[PDB]
Design a protein around this ligand. Structure first.
Ligand SMILES: CCCCC[C@@](C)(O)/C=C/[C@H]1C(=O)C[C@H](O)[C@@H]1C/C=C\CCCC(=O)O
Ligand code: NA
Length: 437
């Protein structure tokens, strides 16, 4: 800037010397694109806003809803960076908002990329453990954990975007335009700049393609294949006369706990004074909070041994165990009350249409982006690709942004419960005016 020089890579040094029009500082404005992205910015913000409200405040909080919630939060952040990308187009393709903002704005785009990929993998593996490890799932699939998993994924997402925040720099074009783009040589360049430019620009493109696209889709496909075969296998068994009403990761070792239950003085008589059905609900508690924890329930165990079911339930509903993970505790409590196994219904899964649509959208929108970015890495050696990447790369990036505008629509189209609770709240907002204004 102020009598400072910086070494640039051939790709950017050429993008800098690219003469738009004829060396005259006059900027052409594609008014069509500006309105498109600007409208997109509006839609994306409003759409993911209402989705966060419906799922968040007007919907029964489950584990699956927790994935959709974070997935729409990322799309909201993308929708929030999109306005600044429209200004970049209105100015005439130039970054006029200092250097430090060129990093944050860009990182936001990459943050939603890693986050969306990680969450979709989590949704897949969740659906897989739901089918392949039913016993372990009904004792540990709690919305509390789902929330904790999302935070770890966000931290991992914020971590893989750190490199992109660092190497984002503002490069001045000859047009008077200011670019906001990679600056591989911004810090500790190598004695062989041609190597560092090729090396780093290729490492970023591949790691991004693996962690944020290839691996997610691999996990997604693998998970889908595993559940598909298990359901094929479960259907075969059901059509046989095997309906009598019946440690390693994601375990299911019943014999192990029964030997610890009988080894505990407080639990042995309660486990002996129980029918077959209520003995299983007691083992489920041990799986969830251990024998040391279930033994803490001094007054409530007394009720179970004495067949005082309804009275025991009141006590458990007052416990922290019920007030932190109610769904799994309600399952165990009611099982003691009724003495049947209906609470563990295990009816078919929901949100299959939703998860399928979002995965398809994720694949089509981010697929093209990663294709051109890798060509960019290969275009260092092969200059013939550079002009194709120059013009073709900005279009695939706008595609990725529009994914955050389509996901909210896919949510509603493929889930009646979603559209239904949106209308009811949309009517309450249009029904207070009518009655006794
Ligand atoms: C982070 C994406 C949203 C930010 C957009 C913005 C303001 O950085 C403007 C960028 C443009 C330039 O500065 C030159 C170049 O034409 C570039 C447009 C083409 C692709 C976008 C980057 C893709 C990647 O990082 O792999
Ligand atoms: Na997303």
């Amino acid at each position: 800037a102020n009598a400072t020089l910086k070494p640039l890579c051939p790709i950017l040094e050429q993008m800098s010397r690219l003469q738009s029009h004829s060396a005259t500082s006059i900027r052409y404005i594609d008014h069509a694109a500006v309105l498109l992205h600007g409208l997109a910015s509006l839609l994306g913000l409003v759409e993911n806003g209402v989705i966060l409200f419906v799922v968040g405040c007007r919907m029964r909080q489950t584990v699956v809803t927790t994935w959709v919630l974070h997935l729409a939060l990322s799309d909201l952040l993308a929708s929030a960076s999109l306005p600044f990308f429209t200004y970049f187009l209105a100015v005439g393709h130039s970054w006029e908002l200092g250097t430090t903002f060129c990093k944050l704005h860009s990182s936001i785009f990459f943050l939603n990329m890693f986050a969306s990929g990680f969450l979709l993998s989590a949704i897949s593996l969740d659906r897989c453990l739901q089918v392949v490890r039913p016993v372990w799932a009904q004792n540990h699939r709690t919305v509390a954990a789902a929330h904790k998993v999302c935070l770890v994924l966000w931290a991992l997402a914020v971590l893989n975007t750190v490199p992109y925040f660092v190497f984002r720099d503002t490069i001045s074009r000859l047009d008077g335009r200011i670019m906001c783009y990679y600056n591989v040589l911004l810090l500790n360049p190598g004695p062989d700049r041609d190597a560092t430019c090729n090396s780093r620009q290729a490492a970023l493109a591949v790691s991004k393609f693996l962690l944020a696209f290839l691996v997610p889709l691999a996990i997604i496909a693998s998970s889908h294949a595993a559940v598909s075969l298990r359901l094929q296998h479960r259907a075969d068994l059901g059509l046989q006369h095997r309906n009598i009403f019946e440690e390693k990761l994601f375990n299911q070792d019943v014999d192990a706990a029964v030997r610890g239950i009988l080894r505990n003085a407080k639990l042995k008589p309660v486990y002996d004074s129980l029918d077959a059905v209520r003995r299983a609900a007691l083992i489920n508690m041990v799986f969830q909070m251990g024998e040391t924890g279930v033994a803490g329930f001094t007054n409530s165990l007394r009720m179970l041994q004495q067949k005082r079911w309804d009275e025991a339930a009141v006590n458990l509903a007052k416990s922290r165990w019920y007030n932190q993970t109610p769904n799994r505790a309600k399952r165990v409590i009611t099982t003691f009350r009724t003495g049947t196994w209906d609470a563990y219904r295990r009816r078919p899964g929901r949100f299959v249409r939703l998860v399928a649509a979002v995965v398809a959208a994720f694949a089509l929108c981010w697929g093209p982006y990663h294709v051109f970015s890798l060509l960019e890495a290969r275009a260092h050696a092969n200059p013939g690709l550079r002009p194709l990447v120059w013009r073709g790369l900005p279009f695939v990036t706008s595609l990725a942004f529009f994914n955050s505008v389509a996901n909210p629509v896919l949510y509603v189209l493929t889930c009646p419960d979603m559209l239904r609770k949106l209308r009811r709240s949309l009517r309450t907002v249009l029904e207070s005016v009518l009655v006794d204004d």
